[PDB]
């Protein structure tokens with residue numbers, strides 16, 4: 001069985017845990033930072049091993065391990081959090097440094113899309129993802145919009161990389 005090590009990175013409060021809980025446990029409530037579940041993606045059985053991290057948590061050694069062995073990364077910001085969008089470049093640069101590669105599978109995720117407060121335009125996000133050469137997916141952990149698509153797209157980016 002193929003295992004995919006995934007890391008979900010982004011500023012505190014953008015909804016990394018909520019997105020992963022929705023994916024793995026199929027619910028939303030308005031704790032766990034690591035998750036592990038077998039799913040079927042395009043007919044292929046995959047074990048997803050997932051860490052959520054803002055890079056400010058106490059277990060730095062574990063974080064660095066996951067960062068080094070992470071095969072794909074979700075770069076998460078919230079559409080009502082301009083600072084979290086601005087932080088994305090820092091996170092991408094950090095991943096590139098630790099992986100020591102310019103071709104690391106990543107997906108840009110704009111979460112909280114159900115909320116009417118928006119300070120980051122979809123155009124801004126699309127433009128950034130284009131510059132990085134990665135997909136952009138709008139999500140809501142609350143409504144489930146885009147949640148499977150975000151993670152499954154990432155798994156597909158990993159497969160394309162391994163080809």
Ligand SMILES: Nc1nc2c(ncn2[C@@H]2O[C@H](COP(=O)(O)OP(=O)(O)O)[C@@H](O)[C@H]2O)c(=O)[nH]1
Pocket residue numbers: 010011012013014015016017018019029030052111112113114115139140141142143
């Ligand atoms: N309305 C809405 N709230 C969300 C969404 N995702 C997360 N939240 C809320 O945002 C807050 C922070 O989410 P959390 O998963 O803890 O963020 P994390 O620090 O990135 O892991 C919590 O109150 C969540 O309920 C979303 O898509 N929509």
